[PDB]
Amino acid sequence: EKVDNPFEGAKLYVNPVWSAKAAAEPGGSAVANESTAVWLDRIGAIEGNDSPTTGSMGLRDHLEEAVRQSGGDPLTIQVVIYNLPGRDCAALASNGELGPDELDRYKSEYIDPIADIMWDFADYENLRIVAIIEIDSLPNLVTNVGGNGGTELCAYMKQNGGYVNGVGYALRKLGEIPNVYNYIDAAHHGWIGWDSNFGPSVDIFYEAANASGSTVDYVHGFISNTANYSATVEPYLDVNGTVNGQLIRQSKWVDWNQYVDELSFVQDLRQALIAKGFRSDIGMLIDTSRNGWGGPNRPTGPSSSTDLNTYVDESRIDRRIHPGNWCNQAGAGLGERPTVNPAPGVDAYVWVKPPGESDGASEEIPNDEGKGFDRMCDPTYQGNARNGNNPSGALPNAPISGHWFSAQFRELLANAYPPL
Ligand SMILES: OC[C@H]1O[C@@H](O[C@H]2[C@H](O)[C@@H](O)[C@H](O[C@H]3[C@H](O)[C@@H](O)[C@H](O[C@H]4[C@H](O)[C@@H](O)[C@H](O[C@H]5[C@H](O)[C@@H](O)[C@H](O[C@H]6[C@H](O)[C@@H](O)[C@H](O)O[C@@H]6CO)O[C@@H]5CO)O[C@@H]4CO)O[C@@H]3CO)O[C@@H]2CO)[C@H](O)[C@@H](O)[C@@H]1O
Numbered sequence: 418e419k420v421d422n423p424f425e426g427a428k429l430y431v432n433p434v435w436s437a438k439a440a441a442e443p444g445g446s447a448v449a450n451e452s453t454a455v456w457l458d459r460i461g462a463i464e465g466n467d468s469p470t471t472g473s474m475g476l477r478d479h480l481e482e483a484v485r486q487s488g489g490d491p492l493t494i495q496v497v498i499y500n501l502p503g504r505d506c507a508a509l510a511s512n513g514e515l516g517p518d519e520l521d522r523y524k525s526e527y528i529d530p531i532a533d534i535m536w537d538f539a540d541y542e543n544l545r546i547v548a549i550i551e552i553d554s555l556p557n558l559v560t561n562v563g564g565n566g567g568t569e570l571c572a573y574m575k576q577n578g579g580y581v582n583g584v585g586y587a588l589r590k591l592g593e594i595p596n597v598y599n600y601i602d603a604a605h606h607g608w609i610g611w612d613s614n615f616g617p618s619v620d621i622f623y624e625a626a627n628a629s630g631s632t633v634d635y636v637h638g639f640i641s642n643t644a645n646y647s648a649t650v651e652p653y654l655d656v657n658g659t660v661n662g663q664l665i666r667q668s669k670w671v672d673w674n675q676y677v678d679e680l681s682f683v684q685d686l687r688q689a690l691i692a693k694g695f696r697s698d699i700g701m702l703i704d705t706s707r708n709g710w711g712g713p714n715r716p717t718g719p720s721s722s723t724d725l726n727t728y729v730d731e732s733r734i735d736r737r738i739h740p741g742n743w744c745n746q747a748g749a750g751l752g753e754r755p756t757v758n759p760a761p762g763v764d765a766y767v768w769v770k771p772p773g774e775s776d777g778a779s780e781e782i783p784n785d786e787g788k789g790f791d792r793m794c795d796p797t798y799q800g801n802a803r804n805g806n807n808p809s810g811a812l813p814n815a816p817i818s819g820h821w822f823s824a825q826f827r828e829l830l831a832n833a834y835p836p837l
């Protein structure tokens with residue numbers, strides 16, 4: 418009885434807090450009326466906490482605003498559920514208020530108040546809430562537990578079941594509300610595109626969707642590339658091709674990944690999830706907030722080089738040093754503006770990460786948000802095993818994640834693709 422695609426035939430929520438930050442930058446008004454997801458990055462964000470990350474508006478404030486913006490017609494707001502115990506277990510920049518042993522608090526003091534507020538808007542027949550479920554959680558239990566590269570925190574979150582159970586709890590509590598549409602976070606191709614990562618991620622997604630009373634029927638779909646930078650389509654790169662006595666997969670960039678872009682990845686992931694037992698009508702989202710890679714450095718066509726790494730590096734639109742470079746990526750532009758059913762199996766390209774909000778601080782900054790200094794956000798960081806021991810490629814002088822980052826917004830705007 419819920420629509421096949423919550424984005425189809427609907428106005429899109431404009432977040433007034435984000436809108437005002439965007440319009441305040443030079444040329445910012447050009448994107449100020451784009452739709453961006455509202456993040457519930459802590460318990461305080463539910464009622465409203467007057468914070469750097471979420472301003473003065475609580476959830477009810479946003480949902481009342483969304484109803485106002487709607488004109489009684491279908492309107493879709495995206496709400497990010499992002500507060501698991503031991504949140505961000507393989508990193509530090511977005512560790513949260515709830516520790517690894519605090520599932521009970523997540524349930525009763527985070528999910529339960531959110532579900533209560535959303536139940537109050539269930540009598541608004543034309544309000545559609547897209548709930549985006551726990552970014553950067555379940556794939557950590559596949560890729561960051563094995564010890565050789567992993568973390569003890571992620572290993573613990575696997576053994577105590579906090580991620581799996583927290584997600585399943587959110588899926589049922591929110592999924593049983595008549596106008597709520599759950600999309601599970603599905604990393605991106607640069608994380609789980611590999612043979613050793615792909616199937617085991619499908620497995621854990623399925624595990625989580627059957628935890629805490631949930632079934633696959635509470636899952637409307639999946640989102641990739643949330644708060645990341647991976648190309649939607651790599652027009653001049655074919656992951657299975659050659660140059661010229663060597664495989665594209667042998668390049669430093671591809672590095673034996675099965676995918677070079679998000680689209681081919683979500684399309685394959687969609688088929689595998691269905692075969693695993695997810696509903697056949699599931700739709701994928703791709704977060705295109707920051708994956709445009711436009712401006713004067715965007716390749717105009719395939720390279721003429723017959724050197725493997727040179728062909729790849731000159732042909733690729735994702736201009737990062739390594740696909741594991743996730744923080745405040747230098748040279749990134751705004752991607753495709755939110756669009757309905759842009760491709761087979763894709764419900765929408767969406768702006769979930771709000772452009773201009775930081776991925777993390779480039780130095781130690783004292784905070785009350787539970788966030789530590791993550792060296793992947795330090796421009797001078799020479800890296801580790803997860804990123805091929807490469808420079809971070811992070812932008813200098815970045816503030817705490819979620820805080821406004823003027824330099825990043827300006828660059829993103831300048832490098833928008835397609836051009837504004
Ligand atoms: O403004 C709104 C709110 O923002 C919140 O902050 C966000 C923030 O914006 C965001 O940046 C962040 O999310 C990131 C995570 O913190 C981070 O840990 C994560 O890193 C991933 C990375 O995406 C991925 O590329 C990497 O892939 C690894 C993989 O694990 C590994 O298995 C694979 O191994 C293969 C080798 O590469 C290969 O050599 C060998 O042959 O095969 C191996 C396979 O067997 O290698 C790849 C490397 O490419 O994994 C890491 C994790 O380990 O990325 C996230 C972004 O995608 O945090 C927040 C949420 O996203 C604020 O907190 C909030 O206040 C605001 O409201």
Ligand SMILES: [Ca+2]
Nearest residue numbers: 421698699700
């Ligand atoms: Ca659908």
Ligand SMILES: [Ca+2]
Nearest residue numbers: 799806807808
């Ligand atoms: Ca190096």
